[PDB]
Design a protein around this ligand. Structure first.
Ligand SMILES: [K+]
Ligand SMILES: [Mg+2]
Ligand SMILES: [Mg+2]
Ligand SMILES: [Mg+2]
Ligand SMILES: [Mg+2]
Ligand SMILES: [Mg+2]
Ligand SMILES: [Mg+2]
Ligand SMILES: [Mg+2]
Ligand SMILES: [Mg+2]
Ligand SMILES: [Mg+2]
Ligand SMILES: [Mg+2]
Ligand SMILES: [Mg+2]
Ligand SMILES: [Mg+2]
Ligand SMILES: [Mg+2]
Ligand SMILES: [Mg+2]
Ligand SMILES: [Mg+2]
Ligand SMILES: [Mg+2]
Ligand SMILES: [Mg+2]
Ligand SMILES: [Mg+2]
Ligand SMILES: [Mg+2]
Ligand SMILES: [Mg+2]
Ligand SMILES: [Mg+2]
Ligand SMILES: [Mg+2]
Ligand SMILES: [Mg+2]
Ligand SMILES: [Mg+2]
Ligand SMILES: [Mg+2]
Ligand SMILES: [Mg+2]
Ligand SMILES: [Mg+2]
Ligand SMILES: [Mg+2]
Ligand SMILES: [Mg+2]
Ligand SMILES: [Mg+2]
Ligand SMILES: [Mg+2]
Ligand SMILES: [Mg+2]
Ligand SMILES: [Mg+2]
Ligand SMILES: [Mg+2]
Ligand SMILES: [Mg+2]
Ligand SMILES: [Mg+2]
Ligand SMILES: [Mg+2]
Ligand SMILES: [Mg+2]
Ligand SMILES: [Mg+2]
Ligand SMILES: [Mg+2]
Ligand SMILES: [Mg+2]
Ligand SMILES: [Mg+2]
Ligand SMILES: [Mg+2]
Ligand SMILES: [Mg+2]
Ligand SMILES: [Mg+2]
Ligand SMILES: [Mg+2]
Ligand SMILES: [Mg+2]
Ligand SMILES: [Mg+2]
Ligand SMILES: [Mg+2]
Ligand SMILES: [Mg+2]
Ligand SMILES: [Mg+2]
Ligand SMILES: [Mg+2]
Ligand SMILES: [Mg+2]
Ligand SMILES: [Mg+2]
Ligand SMILES: [Mg+2]
Ligand SMILES: [Mg+2]
Ligand SMILES: [Mg+2]
Ligand SMILES: [Mg+2]
Ligand SMILES: [Mg+2]
Ligand SMILES: [Mg+2]
Ligand SMILES: [Mg+2]
Ligand SMILES: [Mg+2]
Ligand SMILES: [Mg+2]
Ligand SMILES: [Mg+2]
Ligand SMILES: [Mg+2]
Ligand SMILES: [Mg+2]
Ligand SMILES: [Mg+2]
Ligand SMILES: [Mg+2]
Ligand SMILES: [Mg+2]
Ligand SMILES: [Mg+2]
Ligand SMILES: [Mg+2]
Ligand SMILES: [Mg+2]
Ligand SMILES: [Mg+2]
Ligand SMILES: [Mg+2]
Ligand SMILES: [Mg+2]
Ligand SMILES: [Mg+2]
Ligand SMILES: [Mg+2]
Ligand SMILES: [Mg+2]
Ligand SMILES: [Mg+2]
Ligand SMILES: [Mg+2]
Ligand SMILES: [Mg+2]
Ligand SMILES: [Mg+2]
Ligand SMILES: [Mg+2]
Ligand SMILES: [Mg+2]
Ligand SMILES: [Mg+2]
Ligand SMILES: [Mg+2]
Ligand SMILES: [Mg+2]
Ligand SMILES: [Mg+2]
Ligand SMILES: [Mg+2]
Ligand SMILES: [Mg+2]
Ligand SMILES: [Mg+2]
Ligand SMILES: [Mg+2]
Ligand SMILES: [Mg+2]
Ligand SMILES: [Mg+2]
Ligand SMILES: [Mg+2]
Ligand SMILES: [Mg+2]
Ligand SMILES: [Mg+2]
Ligand SMILES: [Mg+2]
Ligand SMILES: [Mg+2]
Ligand SMILES: [Mg+2]
Ligand SMILES: [Mg+2]
Ligand SMILES: [Mg+2]
Ligand SMILES: [Mg+2]
Ligand SMILES: [Mg+2]
Ligand SMILES: [Mg+2]
Ligand SMILES: [Mg+2]
Ligand SMILES: [Mg+2]
Ligand SMILES: [Mg+2]
Ligand SMILES: [Mg+2]
Ligand SMILES: [Mg+2]
Length: 88
RNA sequence: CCUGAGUAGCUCGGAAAACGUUAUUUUGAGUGAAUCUGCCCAGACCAUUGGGUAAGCCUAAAUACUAAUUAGUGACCGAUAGCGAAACAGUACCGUGAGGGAAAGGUGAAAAGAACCCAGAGAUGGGAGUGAAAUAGAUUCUGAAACCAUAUGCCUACAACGUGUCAGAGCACAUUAAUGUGUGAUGGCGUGCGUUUUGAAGUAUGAGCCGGCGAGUUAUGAUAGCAAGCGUUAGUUAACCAGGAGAUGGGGAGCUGUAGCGAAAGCGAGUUUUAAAAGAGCGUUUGUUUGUUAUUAUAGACCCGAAACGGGUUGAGCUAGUCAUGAGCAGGUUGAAGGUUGAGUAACAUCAACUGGAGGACCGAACCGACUCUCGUUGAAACGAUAGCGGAUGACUUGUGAUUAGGGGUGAAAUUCCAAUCGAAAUCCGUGAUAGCUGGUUCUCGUCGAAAUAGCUUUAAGGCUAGCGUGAGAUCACAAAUAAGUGGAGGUAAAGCUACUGAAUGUAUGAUGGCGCCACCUAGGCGUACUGAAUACAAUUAAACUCUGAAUGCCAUUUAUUUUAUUCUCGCAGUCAGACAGUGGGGGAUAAGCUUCAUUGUCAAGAGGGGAAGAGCCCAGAUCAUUAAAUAAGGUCCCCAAAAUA
RNA sequence: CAAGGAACUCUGCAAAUUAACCCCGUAAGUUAGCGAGAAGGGGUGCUUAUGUAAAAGUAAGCCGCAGUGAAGAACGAGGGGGGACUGUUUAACUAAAACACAACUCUAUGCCAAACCGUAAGGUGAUGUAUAUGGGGUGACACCUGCCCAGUGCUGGAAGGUUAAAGAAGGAGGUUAGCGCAAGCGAAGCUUUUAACUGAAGCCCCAGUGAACGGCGGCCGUAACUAUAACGGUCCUAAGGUAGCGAAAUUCCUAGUCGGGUAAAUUCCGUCCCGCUUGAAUGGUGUAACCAUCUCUUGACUGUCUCGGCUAUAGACUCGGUGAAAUCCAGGUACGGGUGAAGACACCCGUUAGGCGCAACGGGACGGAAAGACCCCGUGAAGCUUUACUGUAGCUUAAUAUUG
RNA sequence: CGGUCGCCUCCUAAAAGGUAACGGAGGCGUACAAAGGUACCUUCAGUACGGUUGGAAAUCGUAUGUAGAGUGUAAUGGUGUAAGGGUGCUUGACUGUGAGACAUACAGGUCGAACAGGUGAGAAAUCAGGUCAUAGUGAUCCGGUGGUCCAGUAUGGAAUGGCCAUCGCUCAACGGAUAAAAGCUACUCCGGGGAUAACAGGCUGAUACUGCCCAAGAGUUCAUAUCGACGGCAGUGUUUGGCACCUCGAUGUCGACUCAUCUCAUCCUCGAGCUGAAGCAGGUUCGAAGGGUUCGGCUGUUCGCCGAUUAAAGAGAUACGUGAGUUGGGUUCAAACCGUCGUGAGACAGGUUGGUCCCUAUCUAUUGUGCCCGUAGGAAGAUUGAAGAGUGUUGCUUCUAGUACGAGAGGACCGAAGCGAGGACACCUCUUAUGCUCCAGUUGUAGCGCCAGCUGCACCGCUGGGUAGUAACGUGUCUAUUAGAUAAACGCUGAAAGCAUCUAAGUGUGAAACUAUCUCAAAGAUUAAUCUUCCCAUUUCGCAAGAAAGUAAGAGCCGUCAAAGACGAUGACGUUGAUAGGUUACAGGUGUAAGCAUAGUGAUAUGUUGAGCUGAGUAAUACUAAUUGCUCGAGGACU
RNA sequence: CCGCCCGUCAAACUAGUUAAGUCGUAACAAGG
RNA sequence: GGUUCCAUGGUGUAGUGGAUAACAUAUCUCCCUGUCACGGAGGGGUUGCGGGUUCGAUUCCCGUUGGAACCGCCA
RNA sequence: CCGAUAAGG
């Protein structure tokens, strides 16, 4: 005897968006490359770093990326692109 | 003046052409013109221009094929091959019929085919004789293996056996002279071969043995590798003609490359987009014809296998129905209707006797049928035997002849019967139907060597792309690996709940209600067996709680070392059923040798040693030989190699 | 086969009793025909005499345990289910409750009839004529067959709305003779397309039709012991199951309650009725006779059984002759525990066992025969069904030609 | 069958990203001309106090409060001078593009610096290519619409296309087979699968069953005589279950019959402790598997209820044992009907009637019986017994004794005797069954030419008896007893632990269980045993567990047989013999034979006549058959 | 006539019988 | 075991696409009659429980009770 | 249209 079985009601899931950090600290970067994909600003933008229509951080100039912790109780993260600054 | 009338057109349904109906061609129904200043055509249609003369007929050559006659050829076959048929083969044989359809060759140069003798009844055998050969003898070229017997030598009747292998006495011989050969008392080790599977000694599968046959081809094209010829206004011919069924010569028709871009007109080392010249896309160069190999497309395309479908023929001699003409039912009972007579009736009705011999009547043989037991189930028999059983003058049984034929016939109807076959006969043809499904696929060695994953799929036993393999080439460092150091992202383990959201324990102060007792009909008051907001103290819980919070892992960079590849391009794949062990979890019940994930390993595709025996556990990675040495996991009383002290 | 006699078994399957002739006797029920060979009993030999054409019979006597001395001859009673009956059926597993049958009813058909075979000719119906033919349903005989025409089917219907082909008043473009400085306009001719309007059947709509496809309910309260509800209220439908029968070939609960049959009764008989889901021509309820039908009780009877035993043949077994079969990887083929692809002749650890036959019986060799019929899979096959899709034979309506 | 099929958010997801399940929770197929863009200004919800309507909570003022407010939405993340609120002006909710990246099999998706044109806000810097961010979406084909610097099949147009923009799909099975599509098959078929179910096995033990731990309580009072809650821990595989590892080139599945075997968690019998055990009869626990554990009614039944007995009518396992052992009642083929479902073909773990069960045994296992060889000289006898097999049940009556006990009622332990049921072994004196070359009676027919008398056939024709043999339904026996070592239990003497204490030393008692006693077989017991008796003990040559001949006990072949027996074998005999047949005599069985005589008319009766006949039985008798025959067979190595 | 009275249903005892049960109002007047 | 429907006054049933709840019987008061039934007038009485969304739930959503209607098969 | 009227006195 099988006795019959009930039915499940929740078996739905969405595609996983590949968010997170893309360029790590110290890595050289050119303008227009993505540094951080997020839903809502988890990492604030600094100098030479822009914002998009999806809160995506992209570079604005050549240089080395660099994360600096700031904000109350050092709970806010900020990214920047320190220009090559070779300066001979 | 004549030049082809139910004609060309047009409408409604079809078709032919590459066209799935449409300018052109044709027609089943209807309608219906004009007459060289005419009619038709040049992809709807009109005008200009141009081309051609429908509604009449005949027409050689080049073209298609070979049953047959003559000559000849073959990198075609040589009795399981070649036509099914080398012989008297469409024969023997099978079937009612259409139809299906075999096997089988060889004496010797010459029959000189064995006179004669012996045994025997004879065939025949042993001699003789012929012959080069008779172990060439009609059983007739050679004569393989499986299979059956005889014998020299060795072993075997206390012995647990995938039948072998490594050692090993004794016994008996002497060779492709080789640390020789035949047997093997005894000791150690030892669960076949292919297939398909995560995994087969397999209580999964296929083969009784031997021998023969039996499965990647051909034609036409495309791409790629290798090689040759010719080359920078290159390269190369197709058909056809001549030549031996030739190499080849003629034949430049054409095909590829030479300039690209754009949908296209078009422009041109530029072009498309755009107002743009800016920007961006594509270009601003490396050829062709063959030979060989690999893959692929169309053909049956590696081989074998369906249930089927469509078209044609042959079957009612069995059986089912109908029709024509015949025959059969031993024997014995019951005694209807009707009629006659008599009584009776006013006359009927009714009753009694006699006659009469009807019944899908009764009993029971031949005959027909098949309800039961037993036997038989490779039978006596592809449906019967013995013993019983039902009908047996009728819707009966039976002989002969005719007739109804297959998306049809017949059917007192069960999917019955239609030649031992019927959810729709038998046979031949399309046909070598198709099969993402089983099974099989044939010589060797060397190098390398996977996957059982993701997405899509009328997809889940299949397919495509990506991932992993292999071959060739490029990239030398800036690429990729192994270690050390540094920087960064994160919110897990843990911990905490005065840092939130829920859950939640006790103590103290206590909103609140329940509960009372009063007064007051409405504003309320004093205690509450008790409920419990909020606050303070002390203690708790959480995948979807976080004021916090690692390690590992990940990304990048620095230094040292290593490899030309884990990176890029091209050719060819296989893989899409996984299994177990440790670790972190989900589902289950902190069950499963369960199921689904992440990660480290093994097996798959991997032997050896330990675990007594074990695919996945531990130690490790088998090129071959050695009766050499040191070790890993594991172990040292005996089986079974190795120990002792305290 | 002694004693018992169904205790056997799913079931008296099988086996057993009776059996021919003659003489007595024969019930309930009934369609008055039957039941019926009912049930139950008796006699059978030989001789003499009497009887007859022959008998049969009659009287006396004799023998045996037994006299149709052997062979061939019906076992019976009672209740129930179904089919009225005789019959027919699945050649080769189902003979029956299935089919058929006489009978009832509905429907179509006026004759070149309806229906049917073919494509048509032709033919069956039928050399028949509504007292005839074809089809659907029910199935003697007796009594009955209730309500619903909402949906579907069939028949008929005035007008009205919608609708194809076809015909057709016109409309819109293409082209250019021509008019115009251009622009643009623009005759006829042809040509592309649209079209008012006319246009049958059918459908929408209106009535009838059930022995046409079919259908034919709930809730609440209520009587002077309790119990129940004659009765009242209300919702919906086209109408809410009438008579009859009812634990049924139908009843799930259920081995329903009670009575009978038995020492004891899931079966049987009668009755009760919340009949989940009975029921009136897919008919309802009874019914004499009949059944190789199903089911239950019973007398006789017996080896079915308590319970097994004996005898005779043919096998089997031995000798002489002829001489197969399926199966088969090679075998020299033990047992216990464990292991293993999870149930071992072969693996590990132990135990036992001289070599080889013959007669037996079947434990195993997941024994042999049949590429599992059950289950699943395949973008498999075939048969059948329908308001699945797309078509089509046939039938019917209109336009057009033959056609005045 | 139910549920789901595309996209988005969180957790599982193990602090990069990614990661599945018919895992746990939710949403979406949009909304906004402002909720967009810009410039400027501005900042919670709640709570406390104070105040008409006005109330717990509308609005006002002040203060407090660090987000519990808002951010259109399902969640997540973000954001309190923000991305939240208000106002003014506007439409960048632009055109042509686009270096570089994220993520990806592809197709698609996401972010974007910067350039040219022309705008909006703003003094300007600057910002604006839709919104705080992530869901709000559908390829290709086909056709339609607008624009157009392209084509226009001889030419000019037109028709028809081309390019750009745009429209029509809950193509939601959402990478979409076609513009268009539902069911039954028990009348079925084909290719495959243990990739996947039904039977059995395997793993698990949720559930089931058995047991234990704590003690609340019940129990004249008293947890623990007997029960045992609320809770917890195990054992078995033993019900219902879970997984899908073996098997779909076949593992026959319920019940019944036959044969049984094993386990103990013991129903009876046997022993003991406690008792709320006076006696009898009980309750519970411990030890114990040797034997036994009935017949019937209904049902296919297992199960179950009922009837009558018994000492008892045990629980399970063995492919829910057993179809190459039987049956086929049930399930489950084709046929038919009822109820119900479906419009239908058909369907129902709903009901009913009927319906094919094959195989000659090769290996191994087992029951019996043989040949060969070994046991070291051969043969004939008699033994011991290592290792084994078989049986083991129990009731009633009398006595003890109406004694023990008990007001009474009732009623023993221990022991003895008699009679039985079941099971087993053997036998045929008795009773029965059978008794196919026996006796008698008797029917029909055909024969012996006829009567009489016999023979063949009719189930051995039928019927009544019946020798030997074979058997039970029959009668004899067994189903005892004893010893040893013990289980549970009880001990005596005794310390560790001056007491106590069955134990540690020592010494006992103790069950149908165990080892023997009882019956059978047994030296292939290769570990091959022991004893007794008998027969071998040559001549030569050379080579000795050597030869040529040459030496006996015994055995076999063959024949007659049955105390035996499928065939072998076993046993008796083979002329010096009673082995078989025949003959003779007798037993037992049958029942007065044929013929004759008498009587009767005849069937028939009487006397001769307890007569005749007789398969196997008992014993004598060589009359016949077992012939006057052939073969095998011995010197025991050495230590 | 605010008289009389019938027939179902319900209860008990043996169709009848029953002091005060329920639904109607059929008959006695022209019983409507 | 699974799936669909329902829960409204004292009893039988409608509505509400969120802002609102009626019908009949029954009940009460008063005419009515000798009285009562019937009749006439007037009066009165409502979303199963929970928990979310909304400013607002009988209505919308998810759970929990009670009553029904369907299914639970192939071996 | 128009129905009813508890028992013994
Ligand atoms: K199987
Ligand atoms: Mg996500
Ligand atoms: Mg064509
Ligand atoms: Mg001309
Ligand atoms: Mg043209
Ligand atoms: Mg002309
Ligand atoms: Mg040939
Ligand atoms: Mg040959
Ligand atoms: Mg012939
Ligand atoms: Mg010769
Ligand atoms: Mg030969
Ligand atoms: Mg030869
Ligand atoms: Mg030996
Ligand atoms: Mg030994
Ligand atoms: Mg061994
Ligand atoms: Mg081995
Ligand atoms: Mg091979
Ligand atoms: Mg397999
Ligand atoms: Mg497998
Ligand atoms: Mg094997
Ligand atoms: Mg198999
Ligand atoms: Mg296979
Ligand atoms: Mg085989
Ligand atoms: Mg040439
Ligand atoms: Mg007759
Ligand atoms: Mg067809
Ligand atoms: Mg059928
Ligand atoms: Mg046939
Ligand atoms: Mg083929
Ligand atoms: Mg196919
Ligand atoms: Mg390698
Ligand atoms: Mg792998
Ligand atoms: Mg993986
Ligand atoms: Mg597939
Ligand atoms: Mg934690
Ligand atoms: Mg907390
Ligand atoms: Mg887990
Ligand atoms: Mg797990
Ligand atoms: Mg697994
Ligand atoms: Mg593999
Ligand atoms: Mg290994
Ligand atoms: Mg090992
Ligand atoms: Mg190596
Ligand atoms: Mg060493
Ligand atoms: Mg050693
Ligand atoms: Mg008897
Ligand atoms: Mg008797
Ligand atoms: Mg019986
Ligand atoms: Mg019985
Ligand atoms: Mg019979
Ligand atoms: Mg009778
Ligand atoms: Mg009846
Ligand atoms: Mg009949
Ligand atoms: Mg009949
Ligand atoms: Mg048949
Ligand atoms: Mg039959
Ligand atoms: Mg005619
Ligand atoms: Mg009928
Ligand atoms: Mg009938
Ligand atoms: Mg009717
Ligand atoms: Mg009508
Ligand atoms: Mg009745
Ligand atoms: Mg029955
Ligand atoms: Mg009855
Ligand atoms: Mg009817
Ligand atoms: Mg009836
Ligand atoms: Mg019959
Ligand atoms: Mg014979
Ligand atoms: Mg195991
Ligand atoms: Mg198969
Ligand atoms: Mg298909
Ligand atoms: Mg992560
Ligand atoms: Mg991680
Ligand atoms: Mg939100
Ligand atoms: Mg905004
Ligand atoms: Mg299309
Ligand atoms: Mg043109
Ligand atoms: Mg899809
Ligand atoms: Mg098959
Ligand atoms: Mg499996
Ligand atoms: Mg357990
Ligand atoms: Mg006590
Ligand atoms: Mg266990
Ligand atoms: Mg059990
Ligand atoms: Mg699995
Ligand atoms: Mg198995
Ligand atoms: Mg097999
Ligand atoms: Mg088999
Ligand atoms: Mg079998
Ligand atoms: Mg015990
Ligand atoms: Mg004993
Ligand atoms: Mg079991
Ligand atoms: Mg069984
Ligand atoms: Mg059993
Ligand atoms: Mg089971
Ligand atoms: Mg068996
Ligand atoms: Mg069986
Ligand atoms: Mg059999
Ligand atoms: Mg078997
Ligand atoms: Mg049966
Ligand atoms: Mg049968
Ligand atoms: Mg059927
Ligand atoms: Mg119906
Ligand atoms: Mg032994
Ligand atoms: Mg005697
Ligand atoms: Mg005579
Ligand atoms: Mg003491
Ligand atoms: Mg003792
Ligand atoms: Mg030896
Ligand atoms: Mg004698
Ligand atoms: Mg005499």
């Amino acid at each position: 005897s099988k006795k019959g079985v009930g039915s499940t009601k929740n078996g739905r899931d969405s595609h996983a968006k590949r968010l997170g950090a893309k360029k790590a600290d110290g890595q050289m970067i050119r303008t227009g490359q993505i540094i951080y994909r997020q839903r809502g600003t988890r990492v604030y933008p600094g100098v030479n770093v822009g914002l998009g229509s999806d809160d995506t951080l992209f570079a604005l100039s050549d240089g080395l990326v660099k994360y600096q912790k700031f904000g109350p109780k050092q709970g806010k993260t900020r990214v920047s692109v320190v220009k090559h600054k070779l300066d001979a």
